[PDB]
Design a protein that fits this description.
The structure is cut from a larger assembly and holds two copies of chain A.
Chain A: H1 4-7, H2 12-42, E1 55-59, E2 72-73, E3 78-82, E4 90-94, E5 100-101, E6 105-107, E7 117-121, E8 127-131, E9 136-141
Antiparallel strand pairs in A: 1-9, 2-3, 3-7, 4-5, 4-8, 6-7, 8-9
């Protein structure tokens, strides 16, 4: 009866406490990973703060089914707010020679302020045509260049880089 | 706008757009030069845009709007002679 080898089979309690050590290290590591990706996913699409409101509009003729309602910006993007009884125009940025420029745009699904349909464009300019085939309406930015940003890289100013 | 004797750093706002920069050749013609937005410089909250030449007139051209930059400090402070941008340079 050599019970001493059973006692020398207790060097894996060192292995036991070290695997509990690296396991709680693993749990705190991926818990910090999940926490920070929760934060950077929550504060990536949060909301934009508005920057200026000084927007006028001028419809030509029978542009009531195309007229925007509440328009503002954030210094980077311009948020148009339509009703739902209105249709969806083709938005255009007036180039400073007077010509037009088709820009990328999307209906923003996150914003539902005041029960509108929000539609952002990715430019800040002074005149915006909203054109369907005959009806159109021109939006005049009388707050152009009054409140810009200083300089940033991401939409919210908690930005990442590599 | 400033320079370092080798590169010329333009500093834009962000409400402005991004022109096509051009170096005026001394006959009066233009010359497209290589340029890049410098990501390291964020002085005064601007968009820095360096070109790789030192000249006297710089056109900044989009389709109808343009602006001419006049170097009234051209050739007043050059370098002596160097090989790299910072003067701790390597060679083989």
């Amino acid at each position: 009866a050599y019970i001493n080898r059973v006692m020398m089979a207790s060097n894996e309690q060192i292995i036991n406490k070290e695997k509990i050590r690296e396991e709680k290290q693993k749990i705190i590591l991926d818990q910090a990973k999940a926490l920070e990706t929760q934060y950077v996913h929550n504060a990536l699409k949060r909301n934009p703060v508005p920057r200026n409101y000084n927007y006028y509009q001028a419809p030509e003729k029978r542009s009531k089914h195309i007229m925007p309602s509440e328009i503002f910006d954030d210094g980077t993007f311009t948020y148009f707010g339509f009703k739902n009884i209105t249709l969806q125009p083709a938005i255009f940025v007036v180039q400073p020679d007077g010509k037009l420029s088709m820009t990328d745009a999307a209906i923003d699904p996150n914003m539902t302020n005041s029960g509108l349909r929000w539609y952002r464009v990715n430019e800040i300019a002074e005149k915006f045509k909203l054109i369907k085939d005959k009806a159109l309406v021109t939006v005049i930015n009388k707050g152009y260049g009054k409140n810009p940003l200083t300089k940033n890289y991401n939409i919210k100013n908690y930005g990442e880089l590599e």
